[PDB]
């Protein structure tokens, strides 16, 4: 193998390099918002983001070693979690704002244009707040993101799973390594490591809730989602 064969800071670099770009929306800023324009804008964006993240998943150590069918499964489970923590990450330094895109910066009050969406914004804002309290770093974030990809689908899949757990461990080592040389005490390393991974629990929740909101919006036929969106969505039920 070769995922097992990286150094701690060879892991970080590979992940930093693998990062997908940041996309703009097609948002005409001279036009105010309605529910249908909102969803449209936000779904159009997520759809274009989906292509990059897939080509990003192929560049995360170990993933390509997994069978095609196991790769599909991990993606179907985590896509919105991954979209979400990315969103949360971009917004970190925009208190009270959600940066869906550099040209699409949403105030929590704007979330109300879409029915039911306001709760989801509040959670996403809080997570972003949390990242700020904790002063989350880029190197850890990319580690967290990879964890989500490898961890969310795994317990619903044959020791293909064992390999996934080895890379999970390698990503833990990596995170500890970062905090160690960030000058953290041994105890301060455990606590932070736990604080970070505990957040993923809330991110799972946001994604579950969000998923249902999307299904809701499609049933309502308020906006037509792309055909990738509607597949990623139907994977969940």
């Amino acid at each position: 193998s070769l995922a097992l064969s990286l150094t701690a800071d060879q892991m970080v670099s590979a992940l930093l390099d693998a990062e997908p770009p940041i996309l703009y929306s097609e948002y005409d800023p001279t036009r105010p918002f309605s529910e249908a324009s909102m969803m449209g804008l936000l779904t159009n964006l997520a759809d274009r983001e989906l292509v990059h993240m897939i080509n990003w998943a192929k560049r995360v150590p170990g993933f390509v070693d997994l069978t095609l069918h196991d790769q599909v499964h991990l993606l179907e489970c985590a896509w919105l979690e991954i979209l979400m923590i990315g969103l949360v990450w971009r917004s970190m330094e925009h208190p009270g704002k959600l940066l869906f895109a550099p040209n699409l910066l949403l105030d929590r009050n704007q979330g109300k244009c879409v029915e039911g969406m306001v709760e989801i914004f509040d959670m996403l804002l809080a997570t972003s707040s949390r990242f700020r309290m904790m002063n989350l770093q880029g190197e850890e974030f990319v580690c967290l993101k990879s964890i989500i990809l490898l961890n969310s689908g795994v317990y619903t899949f044959l020791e293909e799973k064992d390999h996934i757990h080895r890379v999970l461990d390698k990503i833990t080592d990596t995170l500890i390594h970062l905090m160690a040389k960030a000058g953290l005490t041994l105890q301060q390393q455990h606590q932070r490591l736990a604080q970070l991974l505990l957040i993923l629990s809330h991110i799972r929740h946001m994604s579950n809730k969000g998923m249902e909101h999307l299904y809701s919006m499609k049933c309502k036929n308020v906006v037509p989602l792309s055909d990738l969106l509607l597949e990623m969505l139907d994977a969940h039920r």
Partner: peptide
């Protein structure tokens, strides 16, 4: 399914 195509590509 579009995911499978994109992935294997």
């Amino acid at each position: 399914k579009i995911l499978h195509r994109l992935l294997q590509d």
